[model samples]
Structure formats: C-alpha cells, structure tokens
Target: MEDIKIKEIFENIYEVDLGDGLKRIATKSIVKGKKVYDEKIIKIGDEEYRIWNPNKSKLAAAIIKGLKVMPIKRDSKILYLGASAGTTPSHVADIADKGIVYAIEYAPRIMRELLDACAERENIIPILGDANKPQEYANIVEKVDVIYEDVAQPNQAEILIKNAKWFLKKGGYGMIAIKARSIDVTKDPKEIFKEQKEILEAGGFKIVDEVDIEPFEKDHVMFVGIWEGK
Candidate 1:
C-alpha cells in the first residue's frame, strides 16, 4: 500500500509502482473513458491511464525484461503485422498518440473483432489481410517509422523482412516477437532465435537489442532491429 509513481520508460510508455507485488506498466488513454479491456484505470490530474498487463501482451513483457531498443516515438507511425485482436496495437496507438498504427490482421472474423477492439482509437487503422501478402496493403500503408510483428508463422522473420522492405522507412526500426516453438520441433529455442535473427539480418535488418521474455511466455524472444536499406 503506497502511492503510485509512474515513470516514462520508453517514449509514451510508462512503468508504474503502487508498492504492490506485481510489476505494472501503463499508457495514457488517448480517448477518455475508453477501456480496451478489463485493465485497471487510474487518473492523475484529469488524465486517465490504462494499465498494460504483461500476460496480455508480449511488448509489455519485453519492457519488464529490460528492452532497450525501443524505437517507437510519440510521433512515429507504426505498421503492425498479425495484429490479432489488436490488443497490443491499441496500446501502441496510445503510446504513439501523435502518430498512427496500421494493423494487418489475417482472419476476416478476427479482423472484424480487431475493428471493434480499436473502434474508439481513430489513430489505429485496422486492415483485413494476411501479413504474408504485403501486396494487398501497398496502397493503404505508407512508409512507417516502426514495423512491429507478432505473427505466428515459421517464416515470421521473413514476414518482418518482407514487410520492412515494403513499408519501413529507410532508417526505421523493426520489432518482432518470435515464438521459437513455431519454427521447428524440440530444438533449442536459442538456436531458433539465432536462425531467425540471421534471417532478419540477411534481409537488411541490423539488430540493436534482443530480449528473452521468459515466464511471461515460454520459448519467446523479442528482437529490435534497424532497417539497413539497400
């Protein structure tokens, strides 16, 4: 039982300490009275903040795990791949309050749900398409400052690489949450992580930071890389 002290950890993202056992993170709600989920809402001087649950989003976990190469700034536009349910995308929108988020979700049914999840967030543009097919969104998404991926595919890194070349600005950053289990059977997660990192490198990304987001999710890693344009 202690007073809450919120500190900005990355851009608009913040770390919260309420003297409770759980580590907390939050983003100031861009739209007042809009609660994305059942997250705890706090107010300070007329500003409302929605607590970001790490178990609900890997990006939150990466922060708790000491992520360093946070590339999204308050005014940086973001292109999100596999933005299923748009949970993390919604939070990213709040963080990039002055910019925008172009989210691509694969399933039509899921896409419909994604729209509902972010209806109040005008800054979030929900696109219904597969991340593998960047051709579909070429006309919709312009070059962005950050390209984030949480796609579940064996070629997840390739997906990031492909989309980076198409939509990421020359010096922008690409952040991917890799579930190593999806890559191969029973191999060391580290090996798979290495393989995927190499894939991103060969395809033009220069990794700046790597975090093993354990406990929050088993066999998962997040890589932050900068676009090394041709």
Candidate 2:
C-alpha cells in the first residue's frame, strides 16, 4: 500500500503525502469538479482538492517554506490586489468557501483570463482596478479581514498601506509578497527586503511573520502584518 495521509495544518489548507517524496498541499475545491488552470485535482472520498502549486503562487510557496502565520483562514473576507491570472485567487476561493475574495487586477488582458478561471468560483469577485488607487474601489469593496498584496511596483509597500486604510478592518491582517526586482533592479534582495519591511512598519503595519520564497522564486519574500492603525 502506498503511504497516504491527508491532514490540515492551517484552517482549510491540507497537506498530503500520497507515496510521494514531496509534501503536496491543497484546498478542498469549493466548486466541485472544475479545473481553474492546469492544476492537478485529487479526489479523496467525496472531497475534490486542488493543488496549490508553490511555483505558481507565492502564498503557496510561503506555506511550503514553513511560513509561521497563516492569516488567511476559512471564512475570511480578503481583498486581493494584483490578482494577475487568478491562480492564487482560486485557491483562496477554495479555502474561504463561505467568505469572499475581492480580487483586483490592472491589465484588461489578464483580467479576461482571471474572469475565465473564476467564472464558476462564486467566492472570487473579479474587479478591474489598479492597486495604487484603493479609493477607486470604495463603492465595490467592503472592509475585509485580510488584504493580500502581490503588485509589482517600487511603491508596492505604499499601495498595501493605502488599501489597508481604505478597506481593511481594524486589527485586520496584510499579506504582501515582496519582489526585490520590482523595488530595485540592482539592490541586494536582502537589503530590499529589509527596506520594504521598514516601509510597511512605518506605514502602520506591524510585521508578524515573514517567509523567504527563494526556493520557488528568487529575491521574493512574503510578509504577514497586523494593522496597528497608527
């Protein structure tokens, strides 16, 4: 018999070792029997789980890399900035089945693809908006439990802070995936990560947990912060 064990470490997120050397993580699909992308689906009993690829999603990378705090929980309302192609959003949708992910994307081209992936996933609400301007989405987005930022920009930290003020509830969390290349092409990644940490801290976010995702993507770090509202 093959080694098989399915267990949840963080809320709705699951980890399994189905005779594989590597630990595979997944979330039970909210929308049953549907593929969002080219993801491997595992049918365990009546559950349909979608693999949260670390290579494709930084949050998944963080989890795999032993990220201590998982701010995103089941039934958590999330404001996801720079949703890109929506792979991560779909995972978020699966984990937060009863909650909502207000996903914002800038480019129309990617938005179209995100729409396609999220069509059957009702928990993910795709919105066409730039991450820089949070006020623009005032009417559409309500105060959320977590604001997940993945925008690639020099002012990425500022964007997260701005959105937290506009849309994050008091004591809410901010989960930001910081890419060193986006901040400075020539700066040392460790240095850039440090600078970004200071920026977020100065902007009312208290750093709670940090995960370096170099194994999946170089010069990238995921930070989980609690809103201090200073």
Candidate 3:
C-alpha cells in the first residue's frame, strides 16, 4: 500500500489528492473487510481510504461532474432511500463519521446484503421499508439533516416530497437521482428532468444544483436541493 494523503473537498468529503491528477474521492473505507466496485484500499499511518468510484455511483459522478455544495456534513443525519445493497450508503456512513445514516430498502434479498453492510458500521441503520410511505418507518427515524433518494419509481418526486415532509428537517438538504426512463420511458429525458424539477420546486424545495450523469448513467440526472418547508 502506498502512503496516501487525504484532503477535505466538501463537508465530510475528502480528496485523495494524488499529485498526478488521478481522480476524485469522497470518503475513506468504513468496512475494513469488504470491497465495493473492486476499489483499492490505501493505508496511510493508522487510517485506510477507499477509492470512491464515480462510475459505480451516480452521486459520486455528480461530485466528479462538479456539484457546487454538499449538504451532508460530518455530523449531519441522513435518511437514504433505495439503499440497494448499501453500496452508496456505506460511503455515506464513512462521510458522516459523527452522524448516522438510516438506509431504507424495500427488497428483501437486497436488504440482506444491506444488513450485512450495515453490520460492519455501527452508524448505519438499515430499514427494510418502502420510500413511498415514510409513515411506515416514521417511528424509527427522527428528523434528519439530509435526505438522499435513488428510487426508480414513476412517482419519484412525489415519494421524495412525502419523505421530506416527514423526516427532513427545516432547511435540510436533499440529493435525488432522477432516472428518466423509470419516470416515463416514452418521454424525452430532458423533458422528464424539467418536469421533475418543477415538481420538486412546487413541493417546497429550493433547487440548488442539477447535473447530468451522462456517460456514467444514461438518461439520468442528479438533483440537489434544500427543503424550505411550507
């Protein structure tokens, strides 16, 4: 393992800063024995860092594509929707070192893997529930600083809106991965994004940044916004 240097690029996000213009990295590895996307784990002194692959994660791609600000802080609590197998949720757990991540997944088989991933990290709480109905898990989850959604339902924005109203704190941050095909396969991707943007704004979120995660995920957009409660 080579000696690597870590620098903070955003709140709770770190850049490996390899002198040769290598790439972007968000956080170090939280699970010592597990590897996602076959990324290398570099050990420097007493700390170990994992290579955050943007190709594997849309949020990582958004960061690589230059997301202006990250709402996730080192102490920010997160409500992660559609946390499949805990790939990105694991990284979120790494970033929110002083906070907690409540990862929600509906699929049973996938939830097993998610539970295994959460088992390694004490801060990650795995909930096998649907994102569309936040009330199902309302008793277990408290107000969170950030709500990250990656669900592929047709009413994606509506699901986000409902959850935001239930769990997201006032002025909280939201990062949503809008899969255009899932919303409307017949409509154009651009049109779908525009419609989703309008819905989010109408739902009381102030749009902050929008990035097209093309060449990584086709017809997909990442929307970052702040919740301004009605």
Residue-wise C-alpha lDDT for candidate 2, range 139-200, written one tens digit per residue: 99988999998988899999999999898888999999998999999988889999999999
Whole-model lDDT for model 3 versus the true structure?
Answer: 0.84
lDDT of 1 by residue, 1-230 (tens): 57768888878888888888668889988877877777889888778888988888999899888898899888999998875676788789999999989988777888888888888899998887888889888999988999988976798888888898889998899999999988887889889898888888999989999989889999999999989875
Highest lDDT: which candidate? Answer: 2
lDDT of each: 0.87, 0.89, 0.84
Q: Arrange candidates, best TM-score first.
A: 2, 1, 3
Instruction: Choose the strongest candidate by TM-score.
Output: 2
Of candidate 2, the 10-residue stretch with the lowest lDDT total is 15-24
Output the lDDT of residue 58, model 3: 80
Cα TM-score per model: 0.96, 0.96, 0.93
Candidate 3 or 1, higher lDDT = 1
**Model 2 accuracy (lDDT, Cα):** 0.89
Q: Kindly list the per-residue Cα lDDT of model 3 for residues 113-191, writing each as its tens digit.
A: 8877566788988888888888999999999999999988898899889999999998898899999999997988889
Q: What is the lDDT of residue 137 in candidate 1?
A: 89
